[PDB]
Design a protein around this ligand. Sequence first.
Ligand code: VFH
Ligand code: VFH
Ligand code: NA
Lengths: 273, 273
Amino acid sequence: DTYLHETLVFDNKLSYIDNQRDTDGPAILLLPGWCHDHRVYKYLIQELDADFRVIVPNWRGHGLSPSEVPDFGYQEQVKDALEILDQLGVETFLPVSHAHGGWVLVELLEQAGPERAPRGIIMDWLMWAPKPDFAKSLTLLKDPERWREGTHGLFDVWLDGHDEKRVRHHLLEEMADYGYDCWGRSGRVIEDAYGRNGSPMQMMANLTKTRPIRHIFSQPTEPEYEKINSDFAEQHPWFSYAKLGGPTHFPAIDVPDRAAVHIREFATAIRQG
Amino acid sequence: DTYLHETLVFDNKLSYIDNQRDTDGPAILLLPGWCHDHRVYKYLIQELDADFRVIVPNWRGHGLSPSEVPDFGYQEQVKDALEILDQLGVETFLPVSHAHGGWVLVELLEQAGPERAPRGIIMDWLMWAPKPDFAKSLTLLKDPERWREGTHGLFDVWLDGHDEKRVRHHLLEEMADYGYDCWGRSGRVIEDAYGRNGSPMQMMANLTKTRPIRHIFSQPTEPEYEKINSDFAEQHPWFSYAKLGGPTHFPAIDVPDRAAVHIREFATAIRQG
Ligand SMILES: Cc1cc(=O)c2ccccc2[nH]1
Ligand SMILES: Cc1cc(=O)c2ccccc2[nH]1
Ligand code: NA
């Protein structure tokens, strides 16, 4: 929280982490998903603080004081992220997303191009089109009468029967101040993203300039899900994955050391040409 | 449609009008706005055909067969337009834009400089930051559930209670094949353009090399809008305007003779040193 800043981004005052580390590029851009903020990355920032410049933008209506804002999508998140990087004078960066931060990361690869964003790490991001249970969850979040029932079902899936203190603290304390305006929006945007782009996999395959992307995930834990990642990886030389074997949907929190080594590896690859 | 061509522009096959008129410069570059094409200029091309070389580039995913393309902005439109001018071996040109074609025209003045692009004509282009009605329209266009409602509200404003046959034909027939991918994009880019640059007026004032620019418009029709143009013109010797008193947002269609004389005047000024 030493590193927490505010700046005007077009019409919106956005909070963002920036450790202002004077070191060789690329900068690490940690991308929150929906209805949480930089706090998800507090442990991963500890892993990276000393060796890298670390930037964590918070979305419109996101941060330590969540607020009602006009409707926006992953395109707006991309412009917001770049506008912060333009203000900070950051050129080359390695974007790292959690879950539906991924929609922002892939579009940011498309819009920034392969000189500015040569690689991407996507963390715990449902690679297939929505299964019935997840589809239902999106429907609940959009429902003004059942949005909290939506979050409760998703919390259950994300903790996956683990009494994981740090991740429980994130869901129940650090995301407590987020209301229907955010959760409803997340349901609409993610449902729309899947409907329009088909899947994260279809979207990455569809990039104008394919680049090295790694998916590091703990869940879903079933072999069928490992197989779709293995099947995509076999088909696409630029695509790789690592199953982190962490307890929850939030490897940034519950295996921050493991998330860090994959990021350092990609950051190192970028420095080596 | 004698003059309709196709060419590879970086990664995209773009259609463009070129009458290949062998005459003295400058070439007249008619710039379409968002989610229409060269058809908007069919009557203005008739006015200019005999006396000038006339070039009308169509944007990525724009033309007689609209298509889904990766997200691009006014910067990409500028590079596309220049790449076509480079391929055609056109040196000096007079750019003429309709509505949010203007973002392309002003950036094209910046990038081409005052030797290559000594003047610009901007047609019916909202000079002020978005008013509530237009802001709402941008919000609707971006909405995948209400984008068509967005276009319908804009059609209403643009026809302004006129049974204008040619302009009705343009909106309802010649723009009929344009879907959410374009209209959604137009909303995001125009909202971004205003948010980034403030207004067309702020953007023109901010040019590295200020040059003669005329705004010719029919709407908005209210004296307050004439005043902001009069106020900008008083402040900037290079800036002028003419109220065309055409029924609609499309003076290229409903007063093509009037658009033509202002273009000829500027083209003549350029030939006279
Ligand atoms: C923080 C976070 C993680 C998720 O997987 C998610 C999924 C749907 C909606 C909102 C979401 N928010
Ligand atoms: C043809 C055309 C004129 C406009 O004033 C406009 C405004 C917003 C979006 C798209 C647009 N398209
Ligand atoms: Na591979």
